[PDB]
């Protein structure tokens, strides 16, 4: 049968133009009050995943 896309993956990750995988930096969902402004802000930026894990994630989104 058709493979199914991992919905959890499609909700967390993005495939870029050139193949990279992209996600949101972890560690500002809570416990924020004491975290530095430098910390709090750097956790905005999307980050690129390291290839072996990115590549694995990729196989989970067959249709994109």
């Amino acid at each position: 049968p058709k493979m199914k896309t991992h919905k959890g993956a499609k909700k967390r990750v993005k495939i870029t133009a050139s193949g990279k995988v992209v996600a949101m930096k972890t560690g500002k969902r809570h416990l924020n009050w004491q975290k530095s402004g430098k910390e709090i802000r750097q956790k905005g930026r999307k980050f690129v995943l390291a290839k072996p894990e990115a590549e694995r994630i990729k196989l989970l989104l067959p249709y994109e």
Partner: protein
Amino acid sequence: MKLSDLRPNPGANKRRKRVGRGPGSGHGKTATRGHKGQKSRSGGLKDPRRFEGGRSTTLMRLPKRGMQGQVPGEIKRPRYQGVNLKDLARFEGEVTPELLVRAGLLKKGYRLKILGEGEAKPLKVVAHAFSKSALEKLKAAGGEPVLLE
């Protein structure tokens, strides 16, 4: 050029790897699975694309971004599509949506919008909208933009 001349090109039909067939062959006995463990067993190994030993999987430690939407459907609404200027060089005369579709340029059922990467050939073009800077290269290169509906 008869029947015993019909013959596939050099390796466009490889033979197949045949494990389980004696020593010399290279993969007999274990038949390439090495020795024991889950991954030997007739069955797997669980999904190598996400299972991480029982650990919290490297995917699911990552957060979730933005609207996932919810029941009942997706909102249906005006979908667009980008066709450039560098594309319309392959025409002369007027250019319309449905035309552009047939050209193998436009995905049908999306409202064409013209965006200008390139050079505007003296033309009349009919888009559902124009990227502000396609309007530019196009007008002043002697052409006529038709914002249609």
